[PDB]
């Protein structure tokens with residue numbers, strides 16, 4: 001059994017990771033500032049002898065004793081990371097430096113929640129871990145894209161110079177229960193529009209592509225990577241790729257909705273395609289996703305139908 | 313007349329910029345930690361009523377009153393920026409945040425000394441300001457390359473969110489008097505090897521290319537950009553491109569040396585070509601370089617011949 005810190009642990013992915021590690025008998029500390037997450041996502045563990053929740057911003061120094069750190073603290077939705085670009089940049093840079101400083105002092109292993117956005121608007125397909133990416137350093141999404149790229153650089157600098165044990169996950173689009181209704185990402189927007197009979201809002205023509213993974217698959221991958229001997233980056237995603245118009249049509253069908261599909265302005269600097277190569281995770285970890293897309297989407301639709309009731 | 317701060321002002325470029333602004337009658341403050349620069353580069357101004365030198369690391373907070381900030385603090389030579397990757401990353405991230413915080417508080421205009429390295433190992437030619445670059449986020453040079461890319465992102469975040477007036481220069485390879493003998497960049501290495509009859513050490517085959525600019529041209533460009541109304545990035549460089557083997561042959565000829573040219577291992581992740589497009593600087597600033605390559609190299613050779621005497 002281990003002492004484990006999860007930054008961003010009151011968010012969407014972090015709350016599901018908290019559940020797995022608590023069930024396995026570890027001592028878990030969650031750090032969050034509730035910028036985009038909420039106490040409600042982890043409230044079922046409050047009071048348990050092996051759990052603590054701390055209201056703390058990772059840009060401020062933190063001194064505790066742990067064996068492992070899962071570093072997930074950052075806004076993740078484009079409308080929420082572009083809300084305040086200075087906050088986004090400070091979280092990814094100063095926040096990551098503070099957590100590597102902690103790992104160095106106490107001898108902890110640190111895992112970074114990086115992103116497929118490090119690949120930018122890709123010029124190879126699929127995207128494997130050897131691709132360097134195509135990213136605008138001064139566009140409206142750069143506060144996030146460049147913040148995450150430099151966070152990876154920081155991890156490898158501390159490994160080489162100070163002997164810190166590091167792990168890096170490049171996470172592809174993941175969805176599931178506990179996402180906020182006003183999060184603004186595509187799966188939550190389309191499900192809620194369809195449920196209410198409002199127009200599904202496609203940004204641009206809808207020919208751009210993404211590949212979506214259910215949250216339980218991501219959580220199993222994160223724990224496998226943390227406890228492996230692999231320090232170089234590993235893609236964690238589902239290789240099944242579709243267009244955004246196809247995704248709108250599928251959601252409309254699974255919900256059983258009469259919503260119109262409408263076409264609005266394109267998003268500025270929007271990546272036009274995305275598909276992970278997961279050969280490395282398969283061969284080095286023995287990991288692959290096991291939840292089919294329709295099964296996962298049905299679990300998410302159930303969550304949001306309940307939420308609209310928790311409102312009405 | 314203005315109150316002006318120059319971070320990195322005791323280094324190679326910064327010391328020449330200090331000279332220009334002092335001659336023009338401004339009040340100049342230099343901040344430096346002497347990691348790669350030295351007091352000797354600005355010692356001629358010490359005691360002047362309009363000059364102050366402060367021993368200060370930009371990662372530590374700084375509270376002074378100025379009208380303009382030229383932000384040049386970072387190691388610049390690949391052997392010196394790869395010496396300690398953690399120091400390089402902290403300087404470019406935390407240092408830039410502290411200087412933007414200062415500009416916000418006092419209402420100063422800030423100029424960033426960015427780099428052609430933001431373009432990486434390029435896949436277009438020449439390189440104009442609209443190119444996004446091809447950069448390895450986790451290779452041995454990334455501590456510098458990614459540090460500089462995210463520093464640009466930070467400047468535009470403060471302009472948009474807080475109304476800070478910003479200027480961004482993308483600087484291409486620049487050489488001249490005052491470079492350290494053990495700096496490790498190619499112009500200083502080749503000149504000193506040739507002067508001493510030692511082998512000129514070409515890294516790889518020598519087919520890789522660069523375009524070199526004399527320091528006085530860079531300084532005139534930096535002042536023109538600072539005092540313009542152009543906030544988007546501007547390339548400052550000399551468009552004359554040659555191979556590294558051609559440069560070795562030219563230096564050997566200008567020095568009059570019998571040195572052998574030897575071929576050693578390639579540098580890891582070394583950019584294979586580089587040539588600036590300077591149409592934007594020409595049309596928006598009325599600026600172009602005016603010092604020919606041979607004239608500039610002869611000025612640099614004179615400096616190093618004197619230095620080897622200051623040793624012997």
Ligand SMILES: NC(=O)c1ccc[n+]([C@@H]2O[C@H](COP(=O)([O-])OP(=O)(O)OC[C@H]3O[C@@H](n4cnc5c(N)ncnc54)[C@H](O)[C@@H]3O)[C@@H](O)[C@H]2O)c1
Nearest residue numbers: 008011012013033034035036037057058072074076173174
């Ligand atoms: N879900 C995905 O498809 C996806 C894709 C790529 C990367 N990621 C990464 O995984 C992580 C989790 O993403 P998510 O989808 O759960 O989003 P989320 O917004 O639900 O979770 C992020 C959490 O971090 C917290 N946080 C933000 N800034 C903080 C700060 N300065 N100090 C302390 N806490 C802070 C938020 O309050 C929130 O609880 C993020 O780092 C994200 O960039 C997720």
Ligand SMILES: NC(=O)c1ccc[n+]([C@@H]2O[C@H](COP(=O)([O-])OP(=O)(O)OC[C@H]3O[C@@H](n4cnc5c(N)ncnc54)[C@H](O)[C@@H]3O)[C@@H](O)[C@H]2O)c1
Nearest residue numbers: 320323324325345346347348349369370384386388485486
């Ligand atoms: N000369 C070039 O070809 C070139 C090319 C691209 C970019 N640049 C940029 O221009 C700037 C000047 O480069 P240079 O060639 O004069 O190199 P340099 O090494 O001579 O100058 C850098 C100066 O910054 C100082 N410094 C470093 N870290 C510091 C810190 N944390 N706090 C305070 N001072 C610190 C050094 O001591 C030095 O005096 C750098 O930012 C460099 O990245 C130069």
Ligand SMILES: O=c1ccn([C@@H]2O[C@H](COP(=O)(O)OP(=O)(O)O)[C@@H](O)[C@H]2O)c(=O)[nH]1
Nearest residue numbers: 060061062063064097098099101102104105
């Ligand atoms: O237990 C710790 C140790 C350090 N830090 C922060 O991590 C940063 C980076 O640590 P590092 O060891 O690199 O810095 P140093 O001690 O040399 O200043 C420091 O500035 C601290 O603010 C932290 O938050 N918790």
Ligand SMILES: O=c1ccn([C@@H]2O[C@H](COP(=O)(O)OP(=O)(O)O)[C@@H](O)[C@H]2O)c(=O)[nH]1
Nearest residue numbers: 078185186187189201202203208244267270
């Ligand atoms: O209401 C929406 C929300 C998003 N998108 C598009 O769906 C894709 C995925 O967007 P998301 O914000 O979920 O993720 P990311 O862009 O970070 O991959 C992008 O092409 C968006 O422009 C859309 O068409 N309508």
Ligand SMILES: O=c1ccn([C@@H]2O[C@H](COP(=O)(O)OP(=O)(O)O)[C@@H](O)[C@H]2O)c(=O)[nH]1
Nearest residue numbers: 372373374375376409410411413414416417
């Ligand atoms: O005159 C100043 C003002 C601020 N700072 C530093 O700049 C950083 C960023 O400033 P900002 O205004 O963004 O931060 P805030 O005041 O909101 O913390 C601060 O944390 C300070 O340490 C500085 O060095 N000199």
Ligand SMILES: O=c1ccn([C@@H]2O[C@H](COP(=O)(O)OP(=O)(O)O)[C@@H](O)[C@H]2O)c(=O)[nH]1
Nearest residue numbers: 390497498499501513514515520556579582
């Ligand atoms: O002794 C040396 C020093 C550098 N170079 C090469 O010259 C080019 C320019 O190197 P420098 O360090 O001056 O600048 P940068 O790589 O930052 O442009 C690169 O291809 C280097 O590998 C070389 O052949 N011999």
